[PDB]
Swiss-Prot record, chain A:
The chain holds residues 20 to 158 of 174 of the full protein. This is 5-hydroxymethyl-dUMP N-hydrolase. One of its GO terms (molecular function) is protein homodimerization activity. Monomer and homodimer. It comes from Homo sapiens (Human). 5-hydroxymethyl-dUMP binds at G9, S54, G56, E60, S84. It catalyses: 5-hydroxymethyl-dUMP + H2O = 5-hydroxymethyluracil + 2-deoxy-D-ribose 5-phosphate.
Amino acid sequence: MRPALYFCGTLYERIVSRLRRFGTVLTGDRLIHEQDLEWLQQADVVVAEVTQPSLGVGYELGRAVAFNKRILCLFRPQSGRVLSAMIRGAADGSRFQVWDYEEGEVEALLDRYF
Amino acid sequence: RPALYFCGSIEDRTLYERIVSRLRRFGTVLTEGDRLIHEQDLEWLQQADVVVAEVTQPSLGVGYELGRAVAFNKRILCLFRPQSGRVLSAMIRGAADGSRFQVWDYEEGEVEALLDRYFEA
Ligand SMILES: CC(C)(C)C(=O)N1CCN(C(=O)C2=CN/C(=C3\C=CC(Cl)=CC3)N2)CC1
Ligand SMILES: CC(C)(C)C(=O)N1CCN(C(=O)C2=CN/C(=C3\C=CC(Cl)=CC3)N2)CC1
C-alpha cells in the first residue's frame, strides 16, 4: 500500500522531498480549515515539525489523534526550546511518536521510520 | 454546577486570572511524567461543558486541546487580542461556525463584559 502523507509546520523542503519517496504529499479562513480537514482525513500518516510553537499545527495533531491516524512529530532540541508537555505526553511509542532530531539526520530518520 | 475548562500559553498570568475569576461565577474551573499531564488534561477536556481558550499567544498545547475538544463536540470559546499585533492562525479563525465554536476578538478592558455576555445566553 502506498500511504497518503500529510505534512505540517528550506528545512521543510528537505522533509517533504524525502516524504515524496514514500507516498503522495497532500499539503476565506473557513475555506482553508475545510480544505485542511479534508486532507487530514485522507492521510495515512501525519508528519508534523513541532519545533516552533503553533496553534495550527497543534490543532491539526489533535484532530488527527481523534481520527486515529499514525503520527510522527519531529522536534529539534538544539533550537533551545522545551517541547510542550501535551505533545511530548501524547506519544505512545507506536501510533503517535515524538522523535528528537538534529538538522543533518532528517533523511536518515525519515528513511528509518518508513 | 457547569464544568469549565480554561487554557492558554504559559504578565499573561494576571490577564488569565481576570478571565478565570469571571469564569468562576458561572461554574467550576477544572484547570485551576508528561504522559500523566496529557492523561489528566484529556480527562478534564471530556468532563467540560464549555472549553475556553486564550489564543493570542501561539501554543502547540492550546491548539492540541482545541482539536481534541472539537472531536468531542464541545462548546468552545476562543479569545484573541488584535492589539497584540499578531494575526490569528487561519486554522483557529477558520474552525469557527458562529455557534458551537466561536472566535471572539477583544481588548484587555472588556474581558468581564464579554464573558458576562457569552454566559448570559
Ligand atoms: C513544502 C510545503 C509542503 C509547502 C510546506 O512547507 N508545508 C508546511 C506548512 N504547511 C502547513 O502547515 C499546512 C497544513 N495545512 C495547510 C493548508 C491547508 C489548506 C490550505 Cl487551502 C492551505 C494550506 N498548510 C503546508 C506544507
Ligand atoms: C490561573 C490558571 C487557571 C492556573 C491558568 O493560568 N491556567 C491557564 C493555562 N493552563 C493551561 O493552558 C492548561 C490546560 N490544561 C492544563 C493542565 C492539564 C493537566 C495537568 Cl496535570 C495540569 C495542567 N493546563 C493552566 C491553567
